[PDB]
Design a binder for this molecule. Structure first.
Ligand SMILES: O=C(Nc1nnn[nH]1)c1cc(-c2ccccc2)n(-c2ccccc2)n1
Length: 268
């Protein structure tokens, strides 16, 4: 589908010129097979958007570990990382593995993320899971909050919008997860609360959307990926990532939404 990529090439370049940074977009229409690419193979910092794959990784481990999702996890005050709005409310009680996973996806809870990263063997364990579903691009290298440095040219804690999309499609529509675990992942993504102004702001009001956002902040680095379900039609999977050369460059949610629109425009 080289035709549709060329259709939106000039609009995408004008958008990233207005933003003053780089924009990486990949989108595939599972109803036709048409794809749109713009910097889709370049590396962008994952930021918080890794927590979606972190939850899918926990779901795959629950398959051969029955009752993993129900295992209570108690944690002290030192386990609290800045921006842990869900975990700091159960500090005196604890939470379940499934609760921590839903908090990491839907609220980007950081203490919950590090607690789950520890459950999987650290960032290498999550990287191991993505390789095991066919993703050779994804890599996680550090924990919260070190993974958010978004240093120009640093491949640590990065993936490509295409690999993100391809892996998201495998885990939400393909066979990387079993039918029970697949629906829970889609359900966790559908209930995300942090993405109202990104991909969700780019789709019609009747579309069902599951997404996970990321906001390094520095270097104008923010992102969003989603599986969107048009009414009575096959779903589209897409990923939109941005970065910028200067540490104090500001990210733009509006730019992310506008990029999600141009990709849907490219696919129809
Ligand atoms: O990515 C993020 N958030 C999100 N976006 N979409 N969903 N969640 C996100 C949040 C934060 C953060 C900010 C303040 C306090 C605690 C954490 N940092 C962060 C962490 C360290 C250095 C620079 C940025 N990055």
């Amino acid at each position: 589908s080289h035709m549709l990529t060329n259709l939106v090439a000039e609009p995408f370049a004008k958008l990233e010129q207005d933003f003053g940074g780089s924009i990486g977009v990949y989108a595939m229409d599972t109803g036709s097979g048409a794809t749109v690419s713009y910097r889709a193979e370049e590396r962008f910092p994952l930021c918080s958007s890794f927590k979606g794959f972190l939850a899918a990784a926990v779901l795959a481990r629950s398959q051969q570990q029955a009752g993993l999702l129900d295992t209570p996890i108690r944690y002290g005050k030192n386990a609290l990382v800045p921006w842990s709005p869900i975990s700091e409310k159960y500090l005196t009680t604890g939470m379940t593995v499934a609760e921590l996973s839903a908090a990491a996806v839907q609220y980007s809870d950081n203490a919950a993320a590090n607690l789950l990263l520890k459950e999987l063997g650290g960032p290498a364990g999550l990287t191991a899971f993505m390789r095991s579903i066919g993703d050779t691009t994804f890599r996680l290298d550090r924990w919260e909050l070190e993974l958010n440095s978004a240093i120009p040219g640093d491949a640590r804690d990065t993936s490509s919008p295409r690999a993100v999309t391809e892996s998201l499609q495998k885990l939400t529509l393909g066979s990387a997860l079993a039918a029970p675990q697949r629906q829970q992942f889609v359900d966790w993504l559908k209930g995300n609360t942090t993405g109202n102004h990104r991909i969700r702001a780019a789709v019609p009001a009747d579309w069902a959307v599951g997404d996970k956002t990321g906001t390094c902040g520095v270097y104008g680095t923010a992102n969003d990926y989603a599986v969107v379900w048009p009414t009575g039609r096959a779903p589209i999977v897409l990923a939109v990532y941005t970065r910028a050369p200067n540490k104090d460059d500001k990210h733009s949610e509006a730019v992310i939404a506008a990029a999600a629109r141009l990709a849907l425009e490219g696919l129809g």
